[PDB]
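#struct-pred
JK: can someone run the complex with A1JEP? inputs below
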Amino acid sequence: EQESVKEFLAKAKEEFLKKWESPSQNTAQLDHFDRIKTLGTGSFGRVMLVKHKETGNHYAMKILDKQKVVKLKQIEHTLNEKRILQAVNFPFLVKLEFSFKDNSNLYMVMEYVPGGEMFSHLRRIGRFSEPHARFYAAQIVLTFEYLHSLDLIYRDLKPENLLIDQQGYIQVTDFGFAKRVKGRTWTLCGTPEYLAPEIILSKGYNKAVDWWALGVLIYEMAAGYPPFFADQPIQIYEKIVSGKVRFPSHFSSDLKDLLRNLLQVDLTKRFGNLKNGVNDIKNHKWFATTDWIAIYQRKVEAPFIPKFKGPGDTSNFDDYEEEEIRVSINEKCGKEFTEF
Ligand SMILES: N[C@@H]1[C@@H](O)CO[C@@H]1CNC(=O)Nc1ccccc1
Ligand SMILES: N[C@@H]1[C@@H](O)CO[C@@H]1CNC(=O)Nc1ccccc1
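RT: done, structure tokens with the ligand placed:
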């Protein structure tokens, strides 16, 4: 690796650690924003488009209900998400601008990305050509090189978590499963189609699970469907652990060779987890045309520019039932969320 890359990552780790050791807290409040529209929902949280009343800027506000977080055993995960997001800085990660809490909820206010989720675009077009998939994959490779150098495992790669910005580049969102891990970790988490075998088999696992998930993502982008597809999770898991994958005949030979090495069941043989680390991926023939520096600098013209009218346009996101943001008169779960 060239010294310029080594020095970049050394500085990145210094800057991350300073914010990690001393996290920001309580940098806005709810009544500074107007609520516009729900952009996504989950079992313990939602994301809403909001507008800051004084500046007029738009943001995406993630709202987590403290009592639901406790019931679903996500306390440590939500504390990880905020502490990591307030400490990272990289071109292809969503930017956390504010965070705060109140009697009922936790709030993470992120920059709004108007192009929508990669998932929508992939399903609308069918599949991406190899150059188009490779443009996105290169950004994920650089983002995982950055996160892993900070001892962070991401653990939620899937097309829904990759937002497309106004220049057609990726912003990775949802750090709800991200964790700082030196060595192994054990939690069962992630979406079924993207889980590495060692997660399914309840082993201690490491950053190699993110490189497996990259293989699933590249396959899905280039084929239009994931490699271990089946109707119910137990059937998906049986396919994941089996060591077999069928490739469409339209895949290039280089793409199939890269995917055999990312979708390697034995983690000790998986690309990204060998002696040369991420460089076995960056130097693979499928990436021969990739200018890694130009991608990082956002100098490549993107394959696809989302269609939207302005920073408040939500047309690339879909419609959800609109529910109130209720805040109890009494503090809930104060002790559990003291550090947030
Ligand atoms: N599954 C998660 C649940 O809390 C509901 O939606 C979450 C995922 N969605 C986003 O993070 N969306 C987004 C959109 C624009 C900018 C920043 C973020
Ligand atoms: N297709 C674009 C559309 O906005 C109109 O013309 C633009 C031309 N640029 C590219 O396609 N760039 C690119 C870069 C990397 C990989 C694949 C493609």
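RT: quick notes.
Residues 155 and 177 are 6 Å apart (CA to CA).
The first helix runs from residue 3 to 21.
JK: thanks, will look after standup
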